[PDB]
Amino acid sequence: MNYNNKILVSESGLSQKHLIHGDEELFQHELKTIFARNWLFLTHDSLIPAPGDYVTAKMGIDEVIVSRQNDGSIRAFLNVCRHRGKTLVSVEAGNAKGFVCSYHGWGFGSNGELQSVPFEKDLYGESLNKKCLGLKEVARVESFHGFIYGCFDQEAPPLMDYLGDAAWYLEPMFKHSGGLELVGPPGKVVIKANWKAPAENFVGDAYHVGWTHASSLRSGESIFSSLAGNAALPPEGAGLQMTSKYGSGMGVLWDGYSGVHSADLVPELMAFGGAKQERLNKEIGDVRARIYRSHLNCTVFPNNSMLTCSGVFKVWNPIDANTTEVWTYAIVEKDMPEDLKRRLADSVQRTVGPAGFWESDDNDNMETASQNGKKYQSRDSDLLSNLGFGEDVYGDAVYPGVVGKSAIGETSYRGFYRAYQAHVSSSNWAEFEHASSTWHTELTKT
Amino acid sequence: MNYNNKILVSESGLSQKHLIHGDEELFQHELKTIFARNWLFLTHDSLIPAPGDYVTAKMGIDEVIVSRQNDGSIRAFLNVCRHRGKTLVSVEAGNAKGFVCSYHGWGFGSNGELQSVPFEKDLYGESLNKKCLGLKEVARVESFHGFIYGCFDQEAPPLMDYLGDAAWYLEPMFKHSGGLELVGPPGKVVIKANWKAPAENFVGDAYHVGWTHASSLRSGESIFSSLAGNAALPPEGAGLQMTSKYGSGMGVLWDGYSGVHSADLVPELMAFGGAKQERLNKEIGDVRARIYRSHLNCTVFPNNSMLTCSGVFKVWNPIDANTTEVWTYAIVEKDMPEDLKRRLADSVQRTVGPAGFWESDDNDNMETASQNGKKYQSRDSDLLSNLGFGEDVYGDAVYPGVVGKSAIGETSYRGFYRAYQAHVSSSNWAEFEHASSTWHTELTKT
Amino acid sequence: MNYNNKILVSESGLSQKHLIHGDEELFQHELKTIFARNWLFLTHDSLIPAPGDYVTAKMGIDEVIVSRQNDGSIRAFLNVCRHRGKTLVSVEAGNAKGFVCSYHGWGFGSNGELQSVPFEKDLYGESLNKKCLGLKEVARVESFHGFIYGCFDQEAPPLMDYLGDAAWYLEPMFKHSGGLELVGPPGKVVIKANWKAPAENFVGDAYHVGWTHASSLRSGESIFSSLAGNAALPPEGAGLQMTSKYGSGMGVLWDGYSGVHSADLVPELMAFGGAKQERLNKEIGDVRARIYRSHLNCTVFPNNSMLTCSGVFKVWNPIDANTTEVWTYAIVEKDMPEDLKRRLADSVQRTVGPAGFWESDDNDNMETASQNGKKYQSRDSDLLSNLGFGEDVYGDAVYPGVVGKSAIGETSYRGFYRAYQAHVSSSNWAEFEHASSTWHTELTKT
Amino acid sequence: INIQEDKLVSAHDAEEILRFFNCHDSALQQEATTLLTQEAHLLDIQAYRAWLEHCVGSEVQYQVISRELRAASERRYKLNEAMNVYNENFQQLKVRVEHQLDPQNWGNSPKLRFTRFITNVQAAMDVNDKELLHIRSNVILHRARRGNQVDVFYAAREDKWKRGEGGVRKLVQRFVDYPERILQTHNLMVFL
Amino acid sequence: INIQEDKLVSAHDAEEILRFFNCHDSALQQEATTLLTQEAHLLDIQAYRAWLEHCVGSEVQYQVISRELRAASERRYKLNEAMNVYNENFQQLKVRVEHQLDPQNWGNSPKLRFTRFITNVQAAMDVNDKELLHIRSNVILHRARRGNQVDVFYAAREDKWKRGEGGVRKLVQRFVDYPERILQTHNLMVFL
Amino acid sequence: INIQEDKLVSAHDAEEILRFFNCHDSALQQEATTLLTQEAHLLDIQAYRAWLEHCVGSEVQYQVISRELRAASERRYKLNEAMNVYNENFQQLKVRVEHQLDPQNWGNSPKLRFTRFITNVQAAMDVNDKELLHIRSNVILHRARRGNQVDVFYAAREDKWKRGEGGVRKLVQRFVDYPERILQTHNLMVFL
Ligand SMILES: c1ccc2cc3ccccc3cc2c1
Ligand SMILES: c1ccc2cc3ccccc3cc2c1
Ligand SMILES: c1ccc2cc3ccccc3cc2c1
Ligand code: FES
Numbered sequence A, B, C: 001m002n003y004n005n006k007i008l009v010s011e012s013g014l015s016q017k018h019l020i021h022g023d024e025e026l027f028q029h030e031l032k033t034i035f036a037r038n039w040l041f042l043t044h045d046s047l048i049p050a051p052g053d054y055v056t057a058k059m060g061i062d063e064v065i066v067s068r069q070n071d072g073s074i075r076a077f078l079n080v081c082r083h084r085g086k087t088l089v090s091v092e093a094g095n096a097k098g099f100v101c102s103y104h105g106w107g108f109g110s111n112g113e114l115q116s117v118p119f120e121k122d123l124y125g126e127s128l129n130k131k132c133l134g135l136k137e138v139a140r141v142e143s144f145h146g147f148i149y150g151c152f153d154q155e156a157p158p159l160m161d162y163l164g165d166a167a168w169y170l171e172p173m174f175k176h177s178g179g180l181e182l183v184g185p186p187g188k189v190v191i192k193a194n195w196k197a198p199a200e201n202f203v204g205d206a207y208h209v210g211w212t213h214a215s216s217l218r219s220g221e222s223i224f225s226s227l228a229g230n231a232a233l234p235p236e237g238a239g240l241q242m243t244s245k246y247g248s249g250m251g252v253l254w255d256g257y258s259g260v261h262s263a264d265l266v267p268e269l270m271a272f273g274g275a276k277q278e279r280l281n282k283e284i285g286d287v288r289a290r291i292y293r294s295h296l297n298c299t300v301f302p303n304n305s306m307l308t309c310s311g312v313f314k315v316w317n318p319i320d321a322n323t324t325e326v327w328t329y330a331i332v333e334k335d336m337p338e339d340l341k342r343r344l345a346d347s348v349q350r351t352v353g354p355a356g357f358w359e360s361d362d363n364d365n366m367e368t369a370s371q372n373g374k375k376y377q378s379r380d381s382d383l384l385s386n387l388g389f390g391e392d393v394y395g396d397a398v399y400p401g402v403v404g405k406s407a408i409g410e411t412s413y414r415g416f417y418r419a420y421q422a423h424v425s426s427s428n429w430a431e432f433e434h435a436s437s438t439w440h441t442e443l444t445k446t
Numbered sequence D, E, F: 001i002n003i004q005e006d007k008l009v010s011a012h013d014a015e016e017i018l019r020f021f022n023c024h025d026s027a028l029q030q031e032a033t034t035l036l037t038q039e040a041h042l043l044d045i046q047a048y049r050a051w052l053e054h055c056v057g058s059e060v061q062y063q064v065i066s067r068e069l070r071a072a073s074e075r076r077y078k079l080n081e082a083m084n085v086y087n088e089n090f091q092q093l094k095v096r097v098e099h100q101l102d103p104q105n106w107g108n109s110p111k112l113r114f115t116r117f118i119t120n121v122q123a124a125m126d127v128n129d130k131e132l133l134h135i136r137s138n139v140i141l142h143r144a145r146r147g148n149q150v151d152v153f154y155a156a157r158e159d160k161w162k163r164g165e166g167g168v169r170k171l172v173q174r175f176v177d178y179p180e181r182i183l184q185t186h187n188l189m190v191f192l
C-alpha cells in the first residue's frame, strides 16, 4: 500500500477505512510513523522516586528500561544488550545501580553506560571502545506533572506543546489539585483488538456508555447510572468534547467526580472533590475549578488513555493489528487520605482492571470491530465518525481546541484520525507539520 | 506471484502446483477471485422457514446474516455494523424483526435497513442519511430446490446456469424426490487443511475410498464394504464421473442408496429408495430414477460438498491456507418417516460429523497434503490428476457434461482445477468466460 | 529486501544486523540460499545399519526418509507422495522394503521407485509412467565416518571439502578413536529462538560458559567447574578457536575429556580418554592425540552442532525466524564398555537434553536475543562479534584454518557469519566461491 | 434453585443439582470414584474391548451433543437445538471399538497417547429406581499424536450406572453437552 | 520448612504448609471435598444467586492478586507489590452477580459455558478459632463462548470457611495469588 | 486384559491394570492421596529441599522417558526404543535441586510459579514385598514465568513408595512415559 497516497481517513476525519484495524502491513508502518515518532507513556515519578529505581515499559513493540538517575533526572534505554542482543532486564520494577547481562556478563550502569566487561583486559585488551557501547537511549524523556513520557524521535515537539489544547483541560486535576500519583503495579491483560479501538473509545466515545455498559451502570449504581440502557440522554449542557492538533482529545462530563465508582464510594468522593473545588475557585477560577471535578475521558495520542476522577490510567500496548496488551493503573490525588487512595485504587481495578466488570462490557465491541477489519468485504468499508460535524468550533473564549459543545459526539474521533492520517502519510515531523497547518479549519468545515 | 501468467494448473487440469494448498498470498487472492466471485452455500428453507427467521453463515472469511423477509424472499447482509464495524449478531440462528448493535445501539431491520439510531433527533438532527446506511447486502441470493446460495458478485451467472451439467444429476434427488430438507444444527470442527483438499476429495475421489476408509468400511459393514483394503475394485460399469464448465462435479456410484450408513440402516434405506425409484421410472424415466437412488459424491464449486443418499452436506469454510472450518449437516428426503429422518441425521454425524469415524480416516491425508504445500522442496512440485485422461467424453446422448464412464478416475478433479485456474487468472466474470470458451475440448484432449 | 546488496554482515564478520534473527522474509530466503544449498545432518550408520532400516529427518523445513539400501548405500527422499502430496511415512524409524501411501495406496520402494499402484491395469492401463514417478530424491548423500549428511544441491562441494579445515580437528575423535556411534532416539523440543542463535553459541561461544552456566557448573562439579560465575578465566593456552571457508568452526578446550558431565563420570572418562590418547600418540602424534581428548564445541554449518567428549550432538531444525526444533543425540566411542556408553548417553540428556539443566541456562539468552530481532528499534542494530579480531592467523604450522590461539574469542562467529553472508547474497555455489576467494584474508585483517 | 431468580440456570441443570444436594452418601461417592478411575485407566491404555466388557451396559445410550448458539432471550425460533456428536447404542460403540482396533486404521500408527483427568465426582442413587446410580464427573482428556499434535478436551458427564452381569456396575447412560461449539481439536474422536 | 535453607520458599507459603502437615483429619478433607465440589457445580451452571446464598458468608473477603515481577534478589524497592484483580466484600460480589444476571449484559448472549476441575483438596481446623476451617484447593476453570473462544485459568486457592446461618459452612475468605502476570484470557471475569 | 484381543494394549500396561483391579483397599487410596497432595504442595511452593527430605527415598529411581514413534506393525527394527529425559538417583536429584536453589540461576528471577493438579489416584500393596506401595496418579503441571510464558505438562506416573526413616513413606521409583514426543514447552525442566 502507498501511504503517501492512500486515503485511509477521509477529509475532516469523517470516516476511516475499516482495514486500519486489521492490516498487518499498516501496523508495521505505524511502528515507524506513529510509535517511533510520537510521545508514549512510560511511568510516574511515584513508581521510581529514588535514585536507582527503575521500571520496564513498552514503547510500541520495543521494551525500555526507565531509570531514576543520581541527579534526579530520568533516562530510558532499550532493554537489549549491546553485545549479542539478549534482553537485559527480566523484571518489571526494582532498584539497582546497573544491569548485568545473563549471557556474557556485560555490565551497564543505570545511566546506560557500558561499565564492565568480564575479563576485559585479558580478552579485549584496550581495543573495546566502551564509550560507544552504551545502551541505545530513548532520545526524549519529559514529564507532565510527574507523568513521564518518552519519544524515540529527537525532532518531536516538547511534550507540553504536543498536548496542545488538551493540556488546559488536564491541568486542574494534574497540576492545580496538588498533583496525582500513579498506583501500581498495573493490571496486564491481552485483548484481541487493535490498539486504536480502545484508543478511539476513550478519546471520544460517550455515545456507547448507556448501551454498552447498561448492565454495569445498573448493577453498580454509580453517578452516571441514569444512562443505563439508553433510558436517559444526558441533559442539555452536560458536557463537551475537544480535540487538538497532535491528536489528543477528551470528553468532559460536568461534575461527575465519582465516575465509574459504585455507590459505596460516591458520597466520599463527591465530598472530597467539592471541597477542593471550593478552594480552587479562588485560585484558578470557577470554570477551571469545575473542570477539575468533572469526568474527563481522554486519549493522549497515540495509545495512552485515562478517566480523570474515576482515576483510570491505561496504556494500549500494540502487539499486532489484532492484539493489544492492556496496562491498567489507578491515579489518585496526592492529598487524599491514604485509606481512600487504597479503596479508590481497588475500585479502579474492580471496574476496569483485569476482572473489571465495566471493561468486560467493551471486549466484544473492540475485538470484533478490530477483527472485522481483516474480513475481505469490510477492508474497504468506511467506519463513520460524523456525529456533530459542522457544529464544532475553534478559538472559543472559554474552552480551547476544536470543541463540540455537547456531551455526546465524535469530535475527538475526527481530531484523533486527522492526526493519525497526517502521520501515516508523512516521513518526519516537518512533513506532519506541513500536513497539519490547517488542522482546525479542516475539523470545523460546514 | 503474477496470477495472470503463473501456470498453477497445467493444460487439461492434468496437474497442479503443490503450493496451491499452502501459499497464503494465493489464499488472499482466492478471497477475491474465488470466494467473492462465485456461488457459496448459505442455508436451506428448512432452517429459516418463517418470516424473521435468520441464520449466520460464512461466505469465504466474511460472515453474513441470512434472513427470511415478510414477503417470503431471503436477503443476506454482512454481519458488520455500518457505524464503527462491530459484529452485529453473535448467535447462529434465531427469529427477530431486526438486529441492534451492542456498541452504540444502532438498530437494523431484517431487511438490512437502518431503522433506528439512539437519540437521533438530539444528536444527528436531520443530518443522518439512514437510507444510505443499510447493512452491506449480498448482491445475489438464489435457491436450488430450497438450498440457498449467495454471491457477492452481481455479474455471476444465475445459480442454475452455474451448476451447468451437474444440475441434471442432482435433480432426481433434489427435485423429483419431492424435495430435501437440511437437518441442523451443523457440526463444526476446524481442520488444519486447505479448503481445496476436502473439496477435491468429495468432487472426484472414489479411488481413495477402499484404502483410506479400509477400517470404516470393515467395521460398519455399509453397502460399499467390499472395497475395504482394496480387496475388490468396483465392477465394470459400477459408476461414472462428471464435471462442468463452472467447476462443479461428482462421482456416481450406481444403486448405493444406503451409502456410508452402517448395516443397522441399510435394509430400510434400500427399501425406501427402491420404492420411490419404482414411482419415478414413470415420471422421469429409468436412467434418471436410477440416478435418484445412486450415491453422488459432489462438490458445488468452490467449497460446498455432499454425498446424496448418505445424506451428507458439507461446507469447507476457508480460514487460511492451512486452516478450514468444516460444517456438517444432514440432508433428508421430506417424505421419509420422521423416525427415519432422525436416525439418518444421527448416522450422518456418526460417520462424517465431528466424531465421524469415516471422516477421521481422511484427516491426516488432507492435513499433511495441505501442509506439505508450504514445504520448500514441494512448492513447485506437481500434484497429479491424470487418471482417465483421454477417455473422457462430452455431449453424450444419456449423461451430460464432461464424463468418464468409469466409477474411479480423476475427471472431476480436472474440471474443478480448470475452473479454478480460469478464475485465479481472471479479473471478472467476462474474463472467466473468455478463458472457458473451449472448456470441454480442453478436458477431452488425447 | 535486496539480498544482493543488503549488508547483513559487516566486513570480516565483525557484526550482524539484529534483524537476521527475526526477519521472516530472510528466513524464507535462507530456505533457498542456506538450507537447500548446504550439507545438513541426517543420521548415523548406527541408527540404520541393516538393509531396509530407515529414519525420518528434517532438511530445513522439508522432511525426508533416509533408507539403507540392499547394496549398503543410503538414499534419501522427500517424505511426500508423488500422487496428491500426502506425507508418506508418519513414524520416526523402522525397517521396511517400501512405503505405502495411506491416501490412495501407491507403493514406493526403499529405493524411492514407484513400485505399485492399486488396480493399475484396470485404471491407468499402460499409460502411467511409473519410471518418472519415483520419490523426489535428495541429490547428494555422503558420510563422514558414519555420520550421514544430505544436500539438495547437486553442485555442492564433497562433504569432506565442505568441512574444510574443521575436518582436521574432528578426525582424532571421529576417525582415529576407532569411530563413534550415535545413540538414539534423540530428545526433541521446540524453542522460541532462531536456529542461528544456538548455532553461533556452539560454534564459538566459550565466553558465555562461566556466567550463563554458573549454576550448572557449581551444582554438577564437572571438570570446567572453576569457571562458575566468572570466578576464574581459563589459563593461558587453555585452548583455541578455529573457523573455515564454508562456515564450520569450533572451540578447543585442551584436555577437557569429561566435558559437561558431573563428577559421577569424571574419573572414568578421564581414565578412558587418557588411555586411548597414550595409544594414539604413536599413531597420529602428540598434538592430534591431545585434540582427540580435548573438548571441541563445533558447528558444522549451518545447523548441526556438537560437543566432543561431552558427547553432545545437536540439530537446530528451523521452523520459522523465532521457532526451532532441537534434536539432541549422544555420541559415544564404539570401543567404550557398553555400561559406560549407557551412562554417558543418560548424562548427555541429563545436562543438555529436554530436561538438561545446562541447556535450560541458555533458553532465555537464545529466545530473547532472537525475539528482539523483530523489535522495531533493534532490527537495524549491530550484534557484535569482534572479540579477538586482529589476532587471528591463517596457515599455522600446527593448527589449520583461521585460528585464534586463545580459548575465548569470537573467531568462529566471524567465519560462520562470513560464510552465511556469502550464501545469502549468492544465487548458486559458483557465486559463493567467487564471494569467498579471499575468505581467510578477510578474517585476519588488522 | 429458583430458576426464575437465577435467570442463567436451565431447568435441566437445576434438576441435577437437587439430586446431589439431597442425600450425601460418602461411601457411594467413593465407589463412583473407583468406577470412574478404573474406566479412565482402561480407556487411557486403549483397552477398548475391556472397557466395553467391564464398563459398558448392554442397554447403554452414549450421547455427546453440540448445542447451536441462540439468543439468551430467544423465544420464537423452535427448530432442532442440538446435533449428536455421539448417540450410540452398545452395537454402535462396538463398531467404533472395532474401527480403533482395525490393523488398517492408518491414523493409529504410530500409537496415540491418551491421558484422562477425572474430577468433581458426585454420586446419588435414583429416587424411584433403587438400583440406578447417578454419577456426575468432569473430564480433561489429553490426546497426543504424530510428534506435535496435542488436543485437550473438557467436559462434564452426566452418567447413569446400574449393576449388570456378575453384579458389576456398568454405564447405562452418559450425557455430555460439549461446551465448545466449534471444535479446535481436529475431531472429537475420543471417548469422553 | 526452613526458608533460610529452602531459599525459594516464601514465609507465607511455609506457614501454610505447616497448617496441613500437622493434624490430618480424613473426615474433614472429605467434608471440604464436598463443599468445594458443590460450590463449583453451582458456579458451573451459573447459579450465581444460589452460590451467594449457599456458599458465601456475609463477612467474606474474596481476593485475587497479581504480583509485580521483581528480582529474586531485590531488597531495596519497596512499593506496592501487588494489585487486586478482585478484593470483594459480599455487597461487591452481589454487584458482580447482578451484572451477570442483567438481561442487558450483552456478553452473556449466547450463554457462556463453564467447566471447573477442583483438585488437591486439603483441610485443617484453625488452631486458635475452633470454628474456622482452612481449605486449600487448586482449580482449572474452562470458559467457552462465541463458538471459538476458549480460556483456561489455573490457580491455587487459600480459603477459610465457617459455619453460618442454618449451620451451613460458608466461604469467609478466598485468597488467590494468580500465577500468570500477563493474562492471555481476554479478562479474568470468572469466579475462581 | 487379553492383549491378543485388545490389540492396542501393551503388555506393560495390562500388567499394571491387574495390580489395581485386584484388592481395593479404600484406606490405602486415601493415604496415597495425602502423600501425593503433600508432595505436589511442597513442589508447587518450590520447597525442593523439603521435597527431597520428606518425599524422596535414598534408593530412588526418578525416570521420565520419551519413546520414539515406530509403526504399530513394526517387528524388525530393534534399536533403543526410548531416551531418558530424566533417569536420576538421589544424588542426581540433589544436583538438580542445588541448581534450582543457586542464586546465579538467572532463569529463576523473577520467581517462577507452579501449580499442580493430581488426579486418578490408585494404590495397591506389592504382592511379594509387603512394604512396597504401588501408586498410580496423573498430573497436570502448570508453569508460568516472565509475564507471558505458560507451559502445561500432562503425564501419568507409575510410582513405588516405601517406608523409610521415621516410618515416613518415600518415593523409591517414579516412571513416566511422556505422552508428547516433541515437547512444545521450551524444556521439561519440571519435576513431574
Ligand atoms: C469512554 C470510555 C469510558 C467512559 C466511561 C465513562 C464513565 C462514566 C461516565 C462517562 C464515561 C465516559 C466514557 C467514555
Ligand atoms: C469421496 C468422498 C467420500 C466418498 C464416500 C463414499 C462412500 C461410499 C461410497 C462411495 C463414496 C465415495 C466417496 C467419494
Ligand atoms: C559452547 C556451548 C557449550 C559449551 C559447553 C562447554 C562445556 C564445558 C566446557 C566448555 C564448553 C564450551 C561450550 C561452548
Ligand atoms: S549478549 Fe549480553 S553480554 Fe553478550
Ligand code: FES
Pocket (backbone or CB within 6 Å): B081, B082, B083, B084, B085, B086, B101, B102, B103, B104, B105, B106
Ligand atoms: S458500532 Fe454499531 S452502533 Fe456503533
Ligand code: FES
Pocket (backbone or CB within 6 Å): C081, C082, C083, C084, C085, C086, C101, C102, C103, C104, C105, C106
Ligand atoms: S496421495 Fe499418495 S496415493 Fe494418492
Ligand SMILES: [Fe+3]
Pocket (backbone or CB within 6 Å): A201, A208, A209, A212, A213, A358, A361, A362
Ligand atoms: Fe466502554
Ligand SMILES: [Fe+3]
Pocket (backbone or CB within 6 Å): B201, B208, B209, B212, B213, B358, B361, B362
Ligand atoms: Fe474419505
Ligand SMILES: [Fe+3]
Pocket (backbone or CB within 6 Å): C201, C208, C209, C212, C213, C358, C361, C362
Ligand atoms: Fe550455553
